[PDB]
């Protein structure tokens, strides 16, 4: 039995929640350019891939995907100037989670995970999440409870760590396009990822300081901010089951049975 | 090579916009009931099958799909009650319009295709465009140029529609989980149909007016507004083929090489 | 005694209100062309004075009609580019309604009809609804109801359409400034159209798809969906009591004593 | 020939407009108690009918009125506590006025008279104002120019006050509902008022500050702010005079030919 | 022990909450022009001030100022053309208002006065609390009280008035960068007050109507609208015991130990 | 002469935007538990402290502050479920920021800087930027720049840091109402702190998962994320040198006399 509610039945997505105990899952990503080598739908196909996998573990469900996210800042996505890329205001981001939150709850769901996949949405959608259960508190309902999460932060394991980035973590607002991402497509989406294309530059700097509008010579000329010459199915298979299993575990700690 | 806007990397999405006439689609769906015997996704899955389909004949691009629509009315989909069912408030799904021509334009693009698959979207992807395009010619830019339209419109031939509709045709309204979405699941998407559950009710009828809050007798149980018992896989193949040739010649005509 | 809220005294309102059963209309129009024959305000002044008639009839009151309305649209209304037409954005509108709800929860009313005049409006009037009635329920009001109908729809009888249309009716979708409105506009306030203006052009037809910005050339050059040489004084006044009895039938249903 | 838009073909407003200095007017007013003896649609009543006059006086064209309005005010309207009274949110109320400017200048108008017939309005029509200039500053338009007013503000010359108040004038902060609106309307609308219903209560006062939520023992119980015994349609008869003919002065000087 | 919350710890803010009849104060400015004798901020300091004395006076507490404003309209602040002068959109000043508000109430405080300094600002406090109170009420919430006031409507003595105005008081509305302001200054802040600076024009004169966009021929030159020539420290000394003596005795009236 | 905005007349503030190279300085703040042992408003006066020492510096403006901020987050200011936490919602902060860049613009001004003293504010002065630069397009001005910066980001510096904790540095993350905001206090507001009531607890940890509603039990009693126990004035002088110096540098670099 699929674990996207979008192939469920009305039927069978009501039997569900009326089992009581309902884990909702929903992808948050964006559609924003990954440099010369990949394809720029990986902030939605990789938090819904570790979403589908999750799912099949705990027994929860995975909402469609959020498909366009919070406008590229240059720090971390490359900048909005680029082309492809394609972004919302904040306050529709915000609203979109909002929205779905009032829906799911009216359904007589409680429980939802949000997976962030775009470094830029996190702020958006934690107030879409307040505003939601504002709203609900209004309405006299006070045991609706989220838990939001950007898959990539589960990546601890200093041993892991040192495994992806021999020469050191910089960061994962410096991973954009870079080996963590790149690898992850190679293990799920190798078709959409052509390494040869890869644009092997030295790791992105910025002063301490944000410049508006984005100057766009700032920024590698590729869009990455930091190479994914290293990327491998391999590791992209280890970031996957890493990010799985703890993710796996911290929903059931949160949505205990 | 990919029509998906989403599957191709920045660059390749650049040089199809430099080439001057590229043409962008973008379906906008909703996530709802449809019946016992079909999935939630139809209103996202339909448009892009077609979508993809024009594409690839006409050599467009197609952008990823708005997944959750305006809320379900009575008269045209069931209704906002059913559980499963999630939809935007119609600002939200304005604003994601908007924002998303907003941006195609920052890229160079100026000819757009929404294909509507969710029947109650309409007035506010209409009032998207047209924030959007009034923000436009505040920057002095004329020559971004909308089609809109609805699938199910292009099937106009009566020898098609008696086929479907033996007994009469009474309307895309009317048309919620029946027929014609039915069949076009059934060729599409076969595995997430089960024609075995279809619910054989006759079709839903309505006064000459409708009533707040949503009165659930009114639709029939299983939220199915027309019966899909008739509803095959040649049918589909045939819708199939009517609306993606109708569609490929009205952007042809409205976006000429 | 007048049945119009706004020509009583608020002493008056109080105890109508108080009577535990009052019943409120409220006409949405818009100011909009209405070709070279006809003056522009029809789509207030036509629900206005079938709400009038009702109310006479039900014992119900009408509240102050909205006189601008969603922007025109090629299809039912010739298109937001005329000289005239004066129209809001679907925010504004959407707003006006929830505002209105809002208030007439406060005073104790628990029965609305709003009475569309203008085709275009019907979605942001839906939304309105939908947004006054969730804040109600905030509120701890769920007793509160409405009714939503455009005056047109109750003349259905293809007995009182072979009358009024001995040459054929061509259908509704053509009826902008038509022989329907230009009839009623006869009947209720001839000297507001001038029957030899009337261009008796072939009645408009379009592609299954819309066009943004509007191509101007797509509508009839006088404004007219179609012809309105045929209209006549008892043409309306069918159209009138019909449509009176219809919805006086409807509301007494909905809202009985 | 008629001096409202509402009343004209589009032919007719367009020729009017394409003369080239026309001069539009838009009365803004409300639903709103008026005391034991006088309707509620008083604030809509009187600045169209001093517009109506003034139109034909100086060749402008009169606007549909904005029917509803902001919040009454306890200090200048009652309070908001009132049955009847039926009120706009600002933001709707500010949208409204920005949406209509929008629009008249679309059709080429660039002469706007706001008349203000409720003073609590005031406040969210300069935002309009405003909001809807600034947009056309984007488009490089600067020559679209508004003359706001108060009708009542024309009726401050001490002569004149003499004449309406021979026995002493006590100020305009409690001209809610008491001579000055109702001898207009006795003057203008003798039908909607019964001056044997007025509730003869000494005149409102406050302290220098306003309480929230409002407490309806500060307002006088009929709703009025003072006595409107003395109203007569003679005094009617001359504010009605002096008001065109000032505002006509006026609006000639700001509009010349 | 200090009357300002920023300066309190959130354990000697909660003990005072906790108390039971504690009250808060927030004052209301702006950043403004204020002649050639005078600084911007004057519509800060000048409420902060007040503030301060009558909460030292009766034990209340006062809250971070607004600093930024609605925009100067040229009848009552010689209008937002100036240089220096930076102004809120409505819904902006509304929506801070209206935050802070549903904030104190999260805290458990229920007694607030809104201190405004800024005399344009008055409307959009008035819609702030009314939709900060209306969400309270949908959250059960029936017993927060607001007191708003403008700070120099407490100056009612005719003694007093006369002391500043010795050839007569014109209004409120007139009095910018003035006798009254410029007095409380030269009390308060001596320095960053140049009395030697002041141009002795004549005070502003206006038709009863407005213009927009604003016309700066229409304000005197130096954004006074009215000279300050006459002003003194006595004078704003004087002022200053006479606001603060009433709005302590105020506050004590509306929300008693 | 002082280097604030609001101290100075207008027509000071024109002489100094006449000049060319005109750079105004913001502090976006916070009004915010800070622990037992330093009052709420910290996240005002200290980036408004830092601009005031850069702005003597390299003759530049300092605007009057934004004293309420987003709200708090658990990982990086406690959380906002505690008293005294006075937060705007994210569209309320991000307007603030608009209107007043709208307003700068207008002014002539082309150079300015944002300084962050909140954490959780930055992505909502992000949104603020991008609105206001995206309306300063639609007039053809793309000649404004901002930029915007965290202060405590230019504690760069590792034999800085090794100054400031000889202990070792135990990161950012934690730095809420610890060692170096206090430090910086004890040097700028000394009477604002009693480090006698600061509770030394470990440093705060957290999962890489964040849940709503909050669960205070995640947050140290006292609020603060960690210890400030080895806070010191000669620590607070080092980091104040430290950040004056380079945030000068910065902004020489981008904005050149
Ligand atoms: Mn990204
Ligand atoms: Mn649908
Ligand atoms: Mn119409
Ligand atoms: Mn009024
Ligand atoms: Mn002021
Ligand atoms: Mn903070
Ligand atoms: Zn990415
Ligand atoms: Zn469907
Ligand atoms: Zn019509
Ligand atoms: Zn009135
Ligand atoms: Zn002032
Ligand atoms: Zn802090």
């Not at 394809?39 to 996998?53: G, H, Y």
């Not at 680029?82 to 529709?92: H, I, K």
């Not at 909002?98 to 775009?118: F, K, P, S, T």
Request: glycine share 10%.
């Amino acid at each position: 039995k699929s674990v996207f509610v979008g192939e469920l039945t009305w039927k069978e997505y009501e039997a569900r929640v009326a089992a009581g105990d309902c884990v909702l899952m929903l992808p948050v990503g964006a559609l924003e350019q990954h440099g010369h080598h990949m394809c720029m739908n990986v902030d939605v196909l990789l938090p819904t891939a570790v979403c589908k996998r999750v799912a099949e573990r705990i027994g929860a469900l995975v909402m469609p995907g959020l498909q366009y996210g919070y406008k590229s800042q240059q720090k971390s996505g490359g900048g909005n100037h680029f082309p492809g890329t394609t972004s919302l205001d904040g306050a529709t981001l915000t609203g979109t989670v909002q929205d779905i939150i009032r829906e799911l709850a009216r359904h007589g769901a409680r429980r939802l995970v949000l997976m962030n996949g775009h470094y830029e949405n996190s702020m958006f959608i934690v107030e879409g999440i307040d505003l939601a259960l504002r709203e609900l508190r209004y309405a006299g309902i006070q045991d609706f409870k989220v838990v939001v999460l950007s898959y990539w932060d589960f990546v601890k394991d200093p041993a892991v760590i040192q495994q992806l980035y021999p020469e050191g973590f910089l960061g994962w607002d410096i991973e954009h396009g870079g080996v963590f991402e790149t690898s992850l497509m190679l293990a799920l989406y190798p078709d959409l990822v052509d390494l040869d294309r890869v644009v092997d530059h030295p790791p992105a700097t910025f002063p301490p300081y944000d410049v508006f509008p984005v100057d766009p010579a700032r920024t590698p000329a590729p869009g990455t901010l930091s190479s994914a010459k290293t990327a491998s199915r391999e590791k992209g298979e280890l970031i996957l089951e890493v990010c799985v299993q703890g993710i796996a575990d911290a929903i059931r700690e949160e949505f205990p049975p």
